[PDB]
């Protein structure tokens, strides 16, 4: 019968729990209290980028630390110049229900997708002066929740039908399918060496995937509700998550445990976005009570607050050299902090 | 001025992009945006056909006014993760089939889905147009099967006109937002253009009564 499943599942859950608890010598709070505090951090608004007419859901910096891209619920996708606040391109969309965008690493393409179950590719460098479509990638049965490029020919997606996927842009067919979640998948983030990626879903669990073998390798538990955002540490050997539990957490890939939690009693709303700084000392978490906080990642104290919007902050991103910090929100304004 | 001859031509470009991005924004302050719901019966097939893979959009005109209608029934995922995209539609259109009171498993299921959207935190000020389908097939089954199969507490007659008037009281007693929003029931007279003119009246009622709150007059 199916009762012979039960002793196999229950012993292996008890075996993994005994293996993790054996190697917990001391916590991160114990060894780090000799280090000096960060002090107080005060940042100010240097630019303000205007021109959208609806709520903003996505944003991604380019790799030269000067260009960026953004998408709203109007049928527009706009590429900005962050030093002079000028507009370079403006792209009309086919469907208006947009939830994702990503910038190419060579600064050559841009991608977009939403409730119409399709990820679309745009070409910025034609011979006529227009941005055109190059591919449309179909095959998911749920809304696209994220997308990231590996190079000019491979893209990893994520949809709400419990399934991640790896594509080929030149041919059109997906070559690897990643299965194993039991709820809708919300986010992903690649690695610095570009061989692994993590993923967080509605199961209150996050998994580590292998890109070339096409299989899961580890799984991390500990949240109490859906996971909305995830981000990868610059070493390549930790990550941080963001949930509707109103709690960020820090996990480890080589000890397979949780290290520290970043909670405070005056916060009751959930996290939308998560990013790190350049040295990996600060943790920036955008919230739902209209502002954004700053956390010391090594000692769990908060250092600053960034308050500039009437409505929910829905996206943020730290640049590749470390100068600026961008935020976007539902009152239709982008602000660059420095 | 302290700008080069290239950098002086990279602001004339950015000012011709805003002049087209504005001219497509009062072009969409003319159009009316409607959401459609209901369980996946055949009631949706009649309404789309009479008004002329994830989202399906339908557009139609009636007396120089433009409507767009959004069917979101083909998704089959978690509803609490995309339903805040439709905050700001004018009116929600709901669909209920009358004759399914005995197939009492179905009729309680439509009451569960009407109650969830009528009291969301995203739809505190949105009118609910309410259609009721299959009025011809309803009087055939009521002569053979009483209403007490579906509603046990029915102390009424079980005649035709006194039973169908008991259905409208049940959907409209679920509203816990009596001081903000309103429901406009209309029996689906499937023969004429009366279907789209009720609905033409239902949106002129809600545009006028929204402007009398923006000027602070109420």
């Amino acid at each position: 019968e199916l009762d012979q499943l039960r002793q196999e599942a229950e012993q292996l859950k008890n075996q993994i729990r005994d293996a993790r608890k054996a190697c917990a010598d001391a916590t991160l709070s114990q060894i780090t209290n000799n280090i000096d505090p960060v002090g107080r951090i005060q940042m100010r608004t240097r630019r303000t980028l205007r021109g959208h007419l609806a709520k903003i859901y996505a944003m991604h910096w380019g790799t030269d630390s000067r260009l960026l891209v953004s998408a709203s619920q109007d049928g527009k996708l706009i590429i900005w110049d962050s030093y002079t606040t000028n507009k370079v391109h403006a792209i009309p969309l086919r469907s208006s229900w947009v939830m994702t965008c990503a910038y190419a690493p060579s600064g050559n393409y841009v991608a977009c997708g939403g409730l119409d179950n399709i990820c679309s590719i745009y070409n910025l460098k034609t011979r006529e002066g227009n941005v055109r479509v190059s591919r449309e990638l179909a095959g998911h049965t749920g809304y696209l929740s994220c997308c990231r490029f590996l190079d000019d020919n491979q893209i990893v997606t994520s949809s709400g039908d419990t399934t991640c996927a790896l594509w080929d842009i030149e041919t059109g067919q997906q070559t690897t399918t990643f299965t194993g979640h039991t709820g809708d998948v919300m986010s992903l983030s690649l690695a610095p060496d570009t061989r692994l990626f993590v993923s967080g879903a509605c199961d209150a669990s996050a998994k580590l995937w292998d890109v070339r073998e096409g299989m899961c390798r580890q799984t991390f538990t500990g949240h109490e509700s859906d996971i909305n955002a995830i981000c990868f540490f610059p070493n390549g050997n930790a990550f941080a998550t963001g949930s509707d539990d109103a709690t960020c957490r820090l996990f480890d890939l080589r000890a397979d445990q949780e290290l520290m939690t970043y909670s405070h009693d005056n916060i009751i709303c959930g996290i939308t976005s998560v990013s790190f700084s350049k040295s990996g000392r600060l943790l920036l978490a955008g919230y739902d009570d209209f502002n954004c906080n700053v956390w010391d990642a090594l000692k769990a104290d908060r250092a600053g607050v960034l308050a500039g919007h009437d409505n929910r902050v829905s996206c943020l991103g730290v640049t590749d050299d470390g100068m600026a910090v961008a935020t976007g929100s539902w009152d239709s304004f982008l602000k660059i902090w420095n | 001025c302290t700008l080069s001859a290239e950098d002086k031509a990279a602001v004339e470009r950015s000012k011709m992009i805003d002049r087209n991005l504005r001219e497509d924004g009062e072009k969409a302050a003319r159009e009316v945006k409607l959401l459609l719901l209901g369980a996946g019966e055949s009631g949706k097939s009649t309404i789309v056909k009479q008004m002329k893979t994830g989202i399906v959009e339908t557009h139609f005109t009636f007396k120089d006014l433009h409507f767009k209608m959004f069917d979101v029934g083909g998704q089959r995922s978690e509803r609490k993760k995309w339903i805040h995209c439709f905050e700001g539609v004018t009116a929600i259109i709901f669909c209920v089939a009358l004759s399914d009171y005995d197939l009492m498993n179905r009729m309680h299921e439509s009451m569960k889905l009407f109650d969830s959207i009528c009291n969301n935190k995203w739809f505190t000020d949105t009118s609910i147009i309410l259609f009721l389908n299959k009025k011809d097939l309803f009087e055939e089954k009521i002569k053979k099967s009483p209403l007490t199969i579906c509603y046990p507490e029915y102390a009424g007659s079980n005649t035709y006109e006194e039973a169908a008037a008991y259905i409208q009281c049940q959907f409209e007693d679920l509203n816990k937002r009596k001081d903000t929003k309103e429901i406009y029931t209309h029996f689906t007279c499937a023969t004429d253009t009366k279907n789209v003119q009720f609905v033409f009246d239902a949106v002129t009622d809600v545009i006028i009564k929204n402007n009398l709150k923006d000027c602070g007059l109420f």
Epitope: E128 | S4, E6, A9
Partner: single-chain antibody
């Protein structure tokens, strides 16, 4: 991508003509346009400009009151109207494409030209070479000079390099001093600083025989150098 243009002929002095070009596909309504000129057996020379959206219009101080320019935008056609022609107007005429935003490459497509023979404060560029003989396989260096610094406070240096094979239109090679255009072999390069600039060629092939020009685009009245000729 094509620009095809016609007109010209024999004109008695004091008369009038108009010139016209046509575009093909091309997304004509996002490109600013120029008219560039050269005399028989002389160098290049710049004439006029009409922007995108028909806003900014500029001219030369030689042609300020005689020539006027206009754009017929839904029909994909560019115009230039001539009044009271003199003997200094015997030349060729070229329609030239450009785009101005961050990262672009202006001056990248010339037309085929049109003959016209009538009846019978500025930054100064200079280059001294004339008809140097070069054995193939060897490296060459060509240099021009400026009377004012072209480096700007924003970091850009505005010097552009061209090439003209005999019987052809000019072609872009180096659009800003450290950047080479698309479709150009990697053996070309360019460096310089301040007011002294030089081009370099790695391995000369048989198709690099022709004249060379250097142009400034810092302050507006555009000035070309004279002609440096390569011969074998």
């Amino acid at each position: 991508v094509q620009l095809v243009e016609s007109g010209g002929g024999l004109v008695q002095p004091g008369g009038s003509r108009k010139l016209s070009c046509s575009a093909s596909g091309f997304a004509f309504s996002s490109f600013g346009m120029h008219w560039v000129r050269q005399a028989p057996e002389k160098g290049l020379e710049w004439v006029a400009y009409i922007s995108s959206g028909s806003g900014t219009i500029y001219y030369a101080d030689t042609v300020k009151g005689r020539f006027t320019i206009s754009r017929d935008d839904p029909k994909n056609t560019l115009f230039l109207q001539m009044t009271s022609l003199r003997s200094e107007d015997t030349a060729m005429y070229y329609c030239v494409r450009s785009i101005y935003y961050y990262g672009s490459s202006p001056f990248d497509f010339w037309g085929q030209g049109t003959t016209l023979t009538v009846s019978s404060s500025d930054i100064v560029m200079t280059q001294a070479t004339s008809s140097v003989p070069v054995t193939p396989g060897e490296s060459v260096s060509i240099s021009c000079r400026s009377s004012k610094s072209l480096l700007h406070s924003n970091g850009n240096t505005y010097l552009y390099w061209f090439l003209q094979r005999p019987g052809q239109s000019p072609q872009l090679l180096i659009y800003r001093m450290s950047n080479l255009a698309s479709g150009v072999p990697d053996r070309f390069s360019g460096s310089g600083s301040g007011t002294a600039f030089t081009l370099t060629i790695s391995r000369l092939e048989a198709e690099d025989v022709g004249v060379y020009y250097c142009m400034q685009h810092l302050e507006y009245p555009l000035t070309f150098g004279a002609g440096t000729k390569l011969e074998l």
